[PDB]
Amino acid sequence: ACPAPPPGQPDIRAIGYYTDKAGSVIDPALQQQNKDATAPLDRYAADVARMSDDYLRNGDPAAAQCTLSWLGAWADDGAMLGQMIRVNNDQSFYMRQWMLDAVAMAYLKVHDQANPQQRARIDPWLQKLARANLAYWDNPKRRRNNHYYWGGLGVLATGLATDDDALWQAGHAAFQKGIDDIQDDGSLPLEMARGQRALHYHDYALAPLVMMAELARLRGQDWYASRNHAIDRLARRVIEGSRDPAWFNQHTGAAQLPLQASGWVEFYRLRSPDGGVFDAAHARGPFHSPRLGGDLTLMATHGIVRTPL
């Protein structure tokens, strides 16, 4: 009834697929090689996201136990607690942040079903992962861009699900850094150097920020107000970017690859509708994103979790 989980691999060996300084031009050959090396990892993400999604959709505890069983197997197996193998960049580290994001959100969604023993196995595994992703960012030479925000998300979900205060604070510090880097024009200076993908990397930066804010809502706090609703400026900048790339075309001097906003709009349109500016994005079908927590449409409408912690 619950299918066998894939074996959990301690090592990650991902491959950077950008050609240029601006991290904007893809080598199709390196991109497929990375796809193939990370395919088992992404398959596990999609699966725990989807069985979690299933639990939020109908409340069948079977779905939640199969998710908890899959998470328990990878924990026992010490999945992703090994060597982050450097090929041409820090892709392996970035994959470990994205993987934590997916499994930690997936755990959060089924946490109310976790028996004492299942907690004892999954909690330390997620904490070991979250502390390794934190210690990366202790080194001042690491550019704290969208990677920091994405790394931040997984740490925050872990601090909330496993009830660890240090990991929660550290998740807050990541969200605060994103907000603090938003200029009066809704722009992130490190994301403005991404040439033809500048607009992509603003949507990509904003998504984990909106998702961390949403996890704060669960605990009772409002992070959306930080620095005078600064995140509203980023939101508006991205969604104005969806419709007209004129502003990004001028400020970078590179023609933007066209963007369709990601599933952050499903939550944000409920918090600051603006003038219905995210409704066109909202119309574009349900949003599935395992690294943001799965079915962002289901979670916005009916809640990240079924029973409030």
C-alpha positions as a printed Julia matrix, in Angstrom:
309×3 Matrix{Float64}:
  0.0    0.0     0.0
  3.02   2.31    0.8
  5.58   1.74   -2.0
  9.33   1.22   -1.2
 11.37   4.45   -0.9
 14.53   4.75   -3.07
 17.79   4.11   -1.09
 19.07   7.34    0.59
 22.48   8.5    -0.77
 24.78  10.37    1.71
 26.75  12.12   -1.13
 25.37  14.7    -3.63
 27.24  15.32   -6.95
 25.45  18.12   -8.86
 26.92  20.16  -11.81
 26.73  23.94  -12.51
 25.36  24.55  -16.06
 25.97  28.34  -16.54
 28.6   29.52  -19.09
 28.88  33.23  -18.19
 29.93  35.43  -15.24
 26.27  36.72  -15.09
 25.0   33.08  -14.53
 22.49  33.72  -17.4
 23.62  31.53  -20.42
 22.88  27.75  -20.17
 25.12  25.0   -21.63
 22.4   22.44  -22.62
 24.94  19.53  -22.22
 25.89  20.47  -18.57
 22.17  21.1   -17.75
 21.12  17.54  -18.84
 24.16  16.06  -17.01
 23.01  17.87  -13.81
 19.37  16.77  -14.47
 20.59  13.07  -14.7
 22.81  13.23  -11.52
 19.98  14.93   -9.47
 17.07  12.87  -11.02
 16.86  10.39   -8.04
 16.92  13.35   -5.56
 14.21  15.34   -7.48
 12.07  12.13   -7.8
 12.09  11.78   -3.96
 11.22  15.53   -3.57
  8.24  15.29   -6.03
  7.04  12.06   -4.25
  7.1   13.34   -0.59
  5.61  16.66   -1.84
  2.8   14.71   -3.63
  1.87  12.25   -0.81
  1.95  15.29    1.59
 -0.28  17.17   -0.92
 -2.61  14.08   -0.87
 -2.88  14.3     2.95
 -3.83  18.05    2.84
 -6.39  17.34   -0.03
 -8.53  14.53    1.57
 -7.01  13.99    5.12
 -6.46  10.21    4.54
 -3.88   9.35    7.27
 -2.51   6.55    4.97
 -0.92   9.25    2.69
  0.65  10.97    5.79
  2.1    7.66    7.18
  3.59   6.69    3.77
  5.19  10.23    3.68
  6.48   9.74    7.29
  7.78   6.22    6.33
  9.67   7.64    3.26
 11.15  10.42    5.47
 12.02   7.79    8.15
 13.9    5.62    5.58
 16.09   8.52    4.3
 16.82   9.52    7.98
 17.91   5.92    8.99
 19.93   5.87    5.7
 21.66   9.19    6.63
 20.54  10.64    3.23
 22.51  13.79    2.11
 24.63  13.92    5.38
 27.78  12.94    3.38
 30.13  14.88    1.02
 28.84  17.76   -1.19
 31.06  16.93   -4.23
 32.37  20.05   -6.11
 32.46  19.52   -9.95
 32.54  23.14  -11.33
 30.69  25.05   -8.49
 28.74  24.73   -5.15
 25.66  23.15   -6.99
 25.79  20.15   -4.53
 25.32  22.6    -1.51
 22.44  24.37   -3.45
 20.84  20.92   -4.12
 21.08  20.09   -0.34
 19.21  23.38    0.5
 16.5   22.66   -2.13
 16.2   19.04   -0.88
 15.9   20.15    2.82
 13.23  22.71    1.66
 11.18  19.86    0.03
 11.48  17.12    2.75
 11.14  19.64    5.7
  7.93  21.24    4.23
  6.66  17.67    3.43
  7.32  16.69    7.1
  5.6   19.87    8.38
  2.4   19.05    6.4
  2.07  15.5     7.92
  3.65  16.35   11.32
  0.26  16.12   13.17
  0.21  12.37   12.17
  3.84  11.56   13.31
  4.02   9.07   16.24
  6.71   9.51   18.95
  9.18   7.03   17.25
  8.85   8.65   13.76
  9.7   12.09   15.33
 12.88  10.6    16.98
 14.25   9.45   13.53
 13.23  12.4    11.22
 13.86  15.36   13.66
 17.67  14.86   14.18
 18.17  14.03   10.45
 16.4   17.33    9.44
 18.38  19.2    12.2
 21.79  17.76   11.07
 20.83  18.91    7.49
 19.68  22.41    8.66
 22.89  23.04   10.73
 25.12  21.91    7.77
 23.2   24.38    5.47
 23.63  27.12    8.19
 27.43  26.55    8.72
 27.91  27.04    4.92
 26.67  30.7     5.3
 28.91  31.45    8.35
 31.76  32.08    5.8
 31.54  35.78    4.78
 32.96  35.01    1.26
 29.67  33.25    0.27
 27.44  35.73   -1.67
 24.13  35.75    0.35
 21.8   36.09   -2.69
 18.63  34.05   -3.56
 20.66  30.9    -2.48
 20.61  32.29    1.14
 16.79  32.81    1.01
 16.25  29.27   -0.49
 18.62  27.81    2.15
 16.77  29.9     4.76
 13.36  28.27    3.94
 14.43  24.64    4.68
 16.05  25.73    8.0
 12.84  27.63    9.01
 10.46  24.7     8.23
 12.89  22.44   10.21
 12.96  24.82   13.26
  9.08  24.92   13.21
  8.38  21.18   12.58
 11.1   19.87   15.01
 10.46  22.71   17.59
 14.06  24.15   17.58
 14.35  27.89   18.47
 17.93  28.46   17.14
 16.93  27.08   13.67
 13.76  29.33   13.71
 15.79  32.53   14.55
 18.37  31.53   11.82
 15.49  31.06    9.31
 14.23  34.54   10.33
 17.76  35.98    9.75
 17.7   34.63    6.12
 14.19  36.17    5.41
 15.32  39.48    7.02
 18.42  39.64    4.7
 16.25  39.27    1.55
 13.8   42.01    2.78
 16.75  44.27    3.83
 18.33  43.94    0.3
 15.1   45.18   -1.47
 15.76  48.7    -2.86
 13.0   51.43   -3.08
 12.43  50.18   -6.72
 11.68  46.56   -5.54
 15.04  45.33   -6.88
 17.68  42.99   -5.33
 21.16  44.31   -6.28
 22.78  40.78   -6.46
 19.85  39.6    -8.73
 20.3   42.68  -11.06
 23.66  41.17  -12.33
 21.89  38.09  -13.85
 21.5   39.71  -17.32
 18.69  38.06  -19.37
 17.57  36.07  -16.21
 17.42  39.15  -13.87
 13.56  39.07  -13.84
 13.58  35.21  -13.37
 15.92  35.56  -10.32
 13.62  38.24   -8.7
 10.63  35.79   -8.85
 13.0   32.98   -7.79
 14.28  35.15   -4.85
 10.74  36.28   -3.81
  9.2   32.72   -3.62
 11.15  31.32   -0.6
 10.75  34.78    1.07
  6.87  34.63    0.78
  6.96  30.94    1.94
  9.1   31.79    5.04
  6.63  34.69    5.82
  3.77  32.09    5.54
  5.53  29.73    8.04
  5.77  32.76   10.44
  1.95  33.26   10.02
  1.54  29.64   11.28
  3.46  30.52   14.54
  1.33  33.75   14.88
  3.92  36.38   13.69
  3.56  38.83   10.7
  6.89  39.13    8.79
  5.21  40.81    5.73
  5.3   44.24    7.53
  9.16  44.14    7.87
 10.79  47.44    6.65
  7.4   49.07    5.76
  6.04  46.15    3.59
  9.34  46.22    1.58
  8.47  42.75    0.1
  5.43  44.42   -1.61
  7.93  46.42   -3.76
  9.66  43.15   -4.88
  6.26  41.46   -5.56
  5.05  44.46   -7.67
  8.46  44.67   -9.46
  8.25  40.94  -10.5
  4.5   41.01  -11.52
  4.98  44.36  -13.45
  7.96  42.38  -14.97
  5.59  39.49  -16.04
  3.6   41.86  -18.32
  6.31  44.37  -19.47
 10.07  43.57  -19.34
 10.84  47.24  -20.33
 12.26  48.2   -16.88
 14.56  45.08  -16.6
 15.51  45.44  -20.32
 16.73  49.03  -19.59
 18.39  48.52  -16.12
 20.44  45.42  -17.21
 20.76  46.29  -20.95
 19.87  42.61  -21.68
 16.53  41.38  -23.16
 14.71  39.41  -20.4
 13.7   35.77  -21.01
  9.89  36.07  -20.61
  8.66  35.17  -17.05
  5.4   33.67  -15.73
  5.23  34.36  -11.93
  5.7   31.3    -9.62
  3.21  30.03   -6.97
  4.15  32.66   -4.33
  1.28  34.67   -5.96
 -1.2   32.01   -4.57
 -0.35  33.14   -0.97
  0.61  36.81   -1.61
 -2.66  37.73   -3.52
 -4.51  36.85   -0.2
 -2.2   39.09    1.95
 -1.81  42.21   -0.32
 -4.17  41.88   -3.37
 -2.78  45.28   -4.56
 -5.22  45.92   -7.49
 -5.83  42.24   -8.42
 -2.32  42.47  -10.06
 -1.53  38.75   -9.24
 -4.99  37.45  -10.45
 -3.73  36.79  -14.06
 -0.86  34.73  -12.5
 -3.46  33.06  -10.13
 -5.62  32.08  -13.22
 -2.68  30.05  -14.67
 -3.79  26.68  -13.13
 -2.74  25.09   -9.79
  0.98  25.65   -8.75
  3.12  22.55   -7.97
  6.64  23.24   -6.58
  8.16  20.46   -4.36
 11.04  22.78   -3.22
  8.45  25.41   -2.04
  6.33  22.64   -0.35
  4.24  21.08   -3.19
  0.7   22.2    -4.2
  1.0   25.95   -3.41
 -2.68  26.41   -4.52
 -3.97  23.79   -2.01
 -1.77  25.2     0.81
 -2.71  28.9     0.22
 -6.51  28.14    0.16
 -6.86  25.45    2.94
 -3.54  25.82    4.94
  0.09  24.55    4.94
 -1.16  22.2     7.78
 -4.68  20.79    8.52
 -4.55  21.21   12.35
 -2.83  24.35   13.78
  0.32  23.32   15.79
